[PDB]
């Protein structure tokens, strides 16, 4: 008995959301130690929140070596991230919560304009339809902590989309306060999946209002998961023919240079014996197709983009190395929506940042869908630490978002890099 309502402060007095917020902050803080409190409290300053959010993203795409160097150097940014995560784990929702998640159009893979008409204040149905066709049922990951603004004061008027969602009861949360807005803080790594969108008018301005489902795409970032390989590809070798296993072993140890060249050159000159091997490798890789949807990583240099190998997104300003924004913007603008081919078999890993690829700055964050032709290389000598998933030849991807990051390479070295979210599409014809 007594029907329980979700936390929903939309269209309620700001003073009610603020006082709920102060109270919720007080309840939260009784469960935290002093170092958690200091790390959470600093989030009141919008500069440090932006800085800690960006850092929380950076470390997912930094090598475990680099993370360990930071921990042993007592890096306070890393400790702060850790303490905020820890604070969040102590505090769970007793009700669903409704509000607005902090995604801008860029973070939904949208680089085109939204308010196109009447002196850039109104939105065309044509544009709404374009946004719908691109975003509905796509999945967009918030790598950092995600913020849920609880009323209309959280809406930035210059940002022409609003993403509204519901957070389920039992989820971990914190509460943050400035003068006029109240927000929940949730864990890193949630995604939004847009389900619908409409044009709405709020206080005299037009927005695309997107209803989005909160989601969790299986993804191990830099930690990887050997367990995922063992559980899904434990019996893999037991299912291969002697011929499949020999061909795949050959590919992994001694044949790969020749097979990769042959496929990358459209099989010219013809070579019947590579044709046999290749057929067997594709065959082996179809024996146990990827069983659920997950993220796998492939780090590359500039060459796939027709750029110099050592293309760099970093420039010097008063001797400080910072991102070159105009290069990031150019690249994001051009490559969002483009397809990327793999004429040979291609290697990925469940680990985002194997330290031998730490300087390859083009990070493919590949959605491997259920049924994709590929295999985790589990059970093969010399391949325990790679956490390789080998993809079938002609695995074609479409890029749907590109997110700039700052990867931490070592104590003295940071590099601007890009996380390229891509999805599987029809094998490129050949």
């Amino acid at each position: 008995p007594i029907i329980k309502e979700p936390i929903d402060f939309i269209n309620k007095p700001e003073s009610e959301a603020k006082e709920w917020g102060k109270e919720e902050e007080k309840r939260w803080f009784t469960k935290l130690n002093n170092l958690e409190e200091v790390a959470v409290n600093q989030l009141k300053n919008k500069e440090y929140k932006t800085k800690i959010d960006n850092f929380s993203t950076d470390i997912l795409f930094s090598s475990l070596t680099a993370i360990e160097i930071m921990k042993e150097d007592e890096n306070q940014n890393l400790f702060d991230v850790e303490r905020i995560r820890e604070a969040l784990l102590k505090n769970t929702l007793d009700r669903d919560a409704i509000g607005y998640v902090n995604f801008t159009p860029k973070e939904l893979g949208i680089n085109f304009s939204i308010r196109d008409v009447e002196l850039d204040r109104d939105i065309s149905d044509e544009t709404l339809d374009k946004v719908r066709q691109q975003i509905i049922n796509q999945e967009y990951t918030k790598f950092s902590f995600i913020s849920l603004g609880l009323n209309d004061n959280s809406i930035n008027e210059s940002v022409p989309v609003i993403v509204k969602t519901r957070v389920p009861t039992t989820f971990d949360y914190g509460v943050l306060n400035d003068k006029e807005t109240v927000s929940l803080l949730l864990n890193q790594g949630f995604s939004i999946i847009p389900e619908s969108a409409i044009i709405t008018t709020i206080k005299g301005k037009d927005y695309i209002l997107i209803e989005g489902s909160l989601s969790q795409e299986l993804d191990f970032y830099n930690k990887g998961s050997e367990a995922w390989g063992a559980e899904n590809y434990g019996d893999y070798i037991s299912k291969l023919s002697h011929e499949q296993l020999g061909a795949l072993e050959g590919y992994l140890h001694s044949d790969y240079k020749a097979i990769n060249s042959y496929l990358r050159n459209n099989r010219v000159p013809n070579n019947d014996e590579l044709n046999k091997k290749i057929e067997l490798i594709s065959s082996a890789l179809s024996v146990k197709p990827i069983p659920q949807t997950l993220i796998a990583y492939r780090r590359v240099d500039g060459i796939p983009f027709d750029l110099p190998s050592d293309f760099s997104f970093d420039k010097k300003e008063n001797g400080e190395i910072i991102a070159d924004k105009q290069k990031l913007n150019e690249f994001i603008d051009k490559w969002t929506g483009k397809e990327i081919e793999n004429l040979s078999f291609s290697s990925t890993s469940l680990k985002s940042t194997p330290s031998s690829f730490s300087k390859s700055r083009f990070i493919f964050r590949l959605r491997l869908s259920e049924g994709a032709i590929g295999a985790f290389i589990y059970g093969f000598s010399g391949f325990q630490d790679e956490q390789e998933i080998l993809l079938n030849k002609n695995s074609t991807f479409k890029i749907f978002r590109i997110t700039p990051i700052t990867s931490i390479i070592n104590r003295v070295t940071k590099m601007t890099q890009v996380v390229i979210d891509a999805e599987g599409i029809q094998n490129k014809e050949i």
Side-chain angles (χ1 to χ4, degrees):
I2 253 258
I3 295 152
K4 36 29 264 209
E5 229 44 56
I7 296 151
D8 193 349
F9 284 105
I10 292 163
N11 211 36
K12 291 192 180 163
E14 153 69 359
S15 64
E16 295 172 22
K18 197 180 186 85
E19 68 199 350
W20 181 93
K22 290 332 284 185
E23 177 61 34
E24 288 292 322
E25 290 158 16
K26 164 155 140 305
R27 288 177 183 177
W28 189 24
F29 275 40
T30 65
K31 310 190 247 192
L32 309 178
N33 66 27
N34 182 64
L35 288 176
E36 287 155 4
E37 284 188 5
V38 168
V40 163
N41 261 148
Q42 291 180 109
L43 297 173
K44 247 133 94 166
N45 179 292
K46 301 218 220 282
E47 219 107 45
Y48 161 100
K49 179 171 180 248
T50 286
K51 162 163 138 288
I52 266 331
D53 277 345
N54 285 337
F55 196 80
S56 80
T57 296
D58 293 340
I59 65 188
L60 308 179
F61 304 101
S62 307
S63 77
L64 286 149
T65 301
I67 299 312
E68 295 157 358
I69 288 167
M70 285 191 278
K71 285 175 177 185
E72 296 174 296
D73 296 337
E74 316 270 38
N75 181 290
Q76 289 308 304
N77 290 334
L78 172 62
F79 292 174
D80 281 341
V81 169
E82 284 162 1
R83 284 170 193 154
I84 288 161
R85 296 183 189 155
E86 179 176 12
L88 287 173
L89 251 24
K90 297 175 153 193
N91 201 50
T92 54
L93 281 166
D94 296 332
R95 304 292 182 224
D96 288 10
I98 293 162
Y100 304 123
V101 290
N102 62 330
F103 276 81
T104 56
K106 273 180 181 164
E107 297 179 284
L108 302 168
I110 297 169
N111 304 318
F112 56 81
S113 66
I114 293 307
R115 295 165 170 156
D116 289 358
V117 303
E118 308 265 353
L119 311 187
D120 293 4
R121 287 168 309 179
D122 296 354
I123 306 171
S124 186
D125 289 358
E126 184 173 8
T127 305
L128 173 66
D129 291 346
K130 189 179 161 69
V131 168
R132 285 172 170 165
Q133 174 276 356
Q134 184 180 311
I135 84 176
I136 295 311
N137 215 8
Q138 186 58 268
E139 193 170 25
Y140 298 98
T141 300
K142 190 95 178 162
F143 302 119
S144 71
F145 298 109
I146 195 170
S147 299
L148 188 88
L150 295 183
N151 66 23
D152 284 15
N153 297 344
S154 296
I155 290 172
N156 188 334
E157 280 157 48
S158 68
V159 177
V161 317
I162 300 164
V163 189
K164 177 175 189 193
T165 189
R166 172 177 210 124
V167 185
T169 176
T170 76
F171 278 31
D172 305 326
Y173 83 108
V175 174
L176 304 172
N177 159 194
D178 68 15
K179 184 183 308 65
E180 298 285 9
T181 64
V182 188
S183 306
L184 307 194
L185 191 68
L186 321 172
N187 289 332
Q188 298 195 229
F190 282 114
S191 298
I192 294 281
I193 296 170
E195 308 289 3
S196 56
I198 59 166
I199 296 169
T200 188
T201 290
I202 304 178
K203 297 196 81 187
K205 310 224 175 68
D206 284 14
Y207 301 86
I208 298 194
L209 172 62
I210 301 175
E211 300 298 330
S213 177
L214 192 71
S215 304
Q216 293 179 282
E217 188 174 29
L218 186 55
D219 189 339
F220 304 102
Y221 308 101
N222 63 338
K223 294 178 180 164
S225 181
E226 186 59 13
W228 187 91
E231 146 160 35
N232 290 291
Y233 288 89
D235 66 7
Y236 181 58
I237 295 168
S238 88
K239 290 172 162 291
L240 303 184
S241 65
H242 183 28
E243 303 96 327
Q244 280 171 332
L245 171 68
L248 173 52
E249 298 262 32
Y251 185 80
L252 291 171
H253 285 106
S254 41
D255 273 17
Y256 57 91
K257 297 132 272 57
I259 286 159
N260 287 345
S261 290
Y262 183 69
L263 288 171
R264 286 167 193 171
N265 286 283
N266 190 33
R267 296 198 194 229
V268 315
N270 189 65
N271 176 329
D272 287 341
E273 93 94 10
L274 294 183
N275 293 340
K276 180 153 219 122
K277 293 185 168 176
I278 284 163
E279 226 273 348
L280 288 166
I281 297 158
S282 282
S283 185
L285 291 174
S286 305
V287 166
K288 199 150 181 196
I290 294 292
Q292 67 195 144
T293 290
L294 58 357
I295 295 297
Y297 288 98
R298 182 167 166 82
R299 266 164 183 278
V300 300
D301 63 16
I303 298 285
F305 308 98
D306 199 18
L307 296 171
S309 56
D310 53 323
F311 182 92
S312 157
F313 284 112
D314 286 302
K315 101 190 122 117
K316 284 184 104 139
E317 206 128 294
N318 316 329
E320 298 277 0
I321 311 313
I322 51 144
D324 184 333
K325 283 154 170 202
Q326 183 180 318
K327 279 192 178 58
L328 289 165
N329 284 350
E330 292 152 11
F331 180 84
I332 289 159
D333 280 7
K334 171 175 177 183
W335 284 94
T336 301
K338 289 191 80 57
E339 300 184 3
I340 291 271
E341 100 201 324
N342 297 273
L343 288 185
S344 200
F345 310 96
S346 45
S347 63
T348 64
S349 186
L350 289 190
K351 297 199 281 209
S352 78
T353 308
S355 68
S356 88
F357 292 91
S358 61
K359 306 178 215 223
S360 295
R361 70 199 92 195
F362 300 88
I363 312 155
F364 286 100
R365 185 159 173 264
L366 309 178
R367 180 179 304 136
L368 302 187
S369 298
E370 186 184 317
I373 307 313
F376 193 111
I377 306 303
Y378 185 80
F380 293 85
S381 308
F383 279 85
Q384 290 195 60
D385 64 33
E386 271 73 15
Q387 296 190 17
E388 182 165 335
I389 296 176
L390 181 57
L391 302 182
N392 198 23
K393 68 187 167 43
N394 213 21
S395 292
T396 307
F397 291 97
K398 178 171 177 77
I399 301 183
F400 68 89
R401 186 176 70 160
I402 296 164
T403 296
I405 71 164
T406 305
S407 186
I408 297 145
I409 308 290
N410 65 45
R411 217 324 225 187
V412 291
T413 309
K414 286 185 301 209
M415 179 173 323
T416 298
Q417 306 195 332
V418 294
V419 184
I420 308 173
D421 279 325
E423 53 176 16
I425 55 167
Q426 181 187 296
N427 289 18
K428 213 62 225 55
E429 264 300 347
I430 235 78

